[PDB]
DNA sequence: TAGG
């Protein structure tokens, strides 16, 4: 059963700073979902630029799509090739409404607590 | 020497002498330790204080049952809330203050919600150990500022119980997030009026008591709740039952109307997974439905609980000494010498105040 | 360290929901092999919550491997008037029937399954948390619930 | 005089 993946800053993932390959959890707004290989195109922007990660589901076959919604994928984000970042959707959940920048703020607070030993 | 029948008083104005009148340290006012001493070395105490409620009652006779000699004048007892006040007790404590009415039509300003100082009033400790005050031959009371006009209320704080080893020196009334783990004791008790004797179907058996005809629906539910740091024992009667279950007016109505017939159904609980500990009917349908809920997070809800210590700081005879623990974490039970449970009366049930974006598909009926 | 006889400790009586990565790093006490130590603070039946990567229909338990982006840890999730009871299950049978691909919470006992810090569910439920709606307050209190007492010394 |  798979490995863990934290929340790196959602605009450093698809650029190539965080070590790819290992497990990761990331979100992204569904724009043109791919149904055959189950490829979501998660977007990435926080007032900086438009990075993009991809999602290819492996385990669950019955998983549909939704228009205009962020998606959380936890799984294998391998070192994907030119202009791509595929996170194998062994965990696939929906995101809507929830204040997400505040979520990353709490994640950074968690990374801060990591130090208090 | 008494004042004479034709003399005159004069205020030697405070602006006239100033040697010692500058040191007019507060007119008699006993302090924290005094009122927190079962044997306050004198007979009369004195204190600043502010009231929250006033209530009257008859001057009942000792043990409620005495002879048929005469009807002594209705020296009607009065009990008053007091938010105890001095320098210390940094958080708001409380007490009840008693006053008799033998020759004592209460003075003015005696309202729920003013500022007043008292003195030379008897502090003692009851047979039930409660601390109290009473009048004497030197009674003293004086308002400090009129009861207010802005009647804005004040709710209870939002904290976590990782700070509350003791029973006082704290926001006695408080609130905190938690998750329910068990019930304690439920009694649906349809009973009489003057004595509250069991009424099956809404009709008693002891009924020799009184001409009342419709029973009274004493609905008691008591819960066990974890809160992230310690245990939480909670009790409620007649108010927090259908809500702790979760039944709307019609729903709890139909509940009591099924349970009407026996009029008295009881369960006891003491922890998670613990089955019926009272002596309810294993065959009645409501028993099985109730316990089917008692094995559900519907009766164990992760919610926000409002609580204040149950044994008032009047005189807290400690419940029980430390005890033992033989329970497993890992693969082994392990022992220490730790303390037993607590008494935090529920005050307002705050339901699952968790986030509302678990789904924007909430409901339509 | 802290002997078992050195535990008036509050969470020694109550549950806890702690840092899964440091729960891994929680010292498995050598006094009793299997109680976790968050700098020396013992629990009885810890609490976790997170996305589930593993699900196996075993003899008495689902196999729910929860990661909350903090770290992985696995859960042996022990497989869980009366007329209107017709509808009764119809509101808790849902939250007690989970599939794979979403988020789940577990609480209960601690055990050691051959190098895995194996949780053993005494209580749990299906959750609509896969959106991580609670998550803001949840992992705002999580660093708080750590920094408060357990990670700190006992008093 | 004064809790269940
Ligand atoms: Zn009766």
Author numbering:
A (entry chain G): 3 to 119
B (entry chain E): 852 to 1058, 1060 to 1217
C (entry chain F): 11 to 17, 19 to 91, 109 to 183
Q: Which of the paper's sentences describe this entry?
A:
The CST–Polα/primase complex is essential for telomere maintenance and functions to counteract resection at double-strand breaks. In addition to its telomeric function, CST–Polα/primase performs an analogous fill-in reaction at resected double-strand breaks (DSBs). We report a 4.6-Å resolution cryo-EM structure of human CST–Polα/primase, captured prior to catalysis in a recruitment state stabilized by chemical cross-linking. Our structure reveals an evolutionarily conserved interaction between the C-terminal domain of the catalytic POLA1 subunit and an N-terminal expansion in metazoan CTC1.
We purified Polα/primase lacking POLA1N (referred to hereafter as PPΔN), reconstituted a CST–PPΔN(–ssDNA) complex as for full-length Polα/primase (referred to hereafter as PPFL), and collected cryo-EM data. We used 131,850 particles to generate the final map with a global resolution of 4.6 Å. The ssDNA was included in the complex, as evidenced by the native gel of the GraFix fractions, but no reliable density could be found for it owing to the low resolution of CST in the cryo-EM map. After initial rigid-body docking followed by flexible fitting and refinement, the overall conformations of the two subcomplexes did not show major changes from their structures in isolation. Thus, we conclude that our structure likely captures a recruitment state of the complex that forms prior to active RNA and DNA synthesis by Polα/primase. The primary interaction interface observed in our structure occurs between the C-terminal domain of POLA1 (POLA1CTD, 1,265–1,462 aa) and the N-terminal OB folds of CTC1. The resolution is limiting for rigorous analysis of amino acid interactions, and analysis of surface electrostatic potential suggests that this interface is not driven by a dominant hydrophobic or charged interaction, but rather by shape complementarity of the two proteins, burying 1,250 Å2 of solvent-accessible surface area. The CRL and one Zn2+-binding domain in POLA1CTD form the module that fits into a complementary cleft in CTC1. CTC1OB-D, an elongated OB fold that shares no homology with known OB folds, forms the major interaction with POLA1CTD. V665 resides on a β-strand of CTC1OB-D, so it is plausible that a glycine substitution would destabilize the β-sheet and OB fold, disrupting the primary interaction.
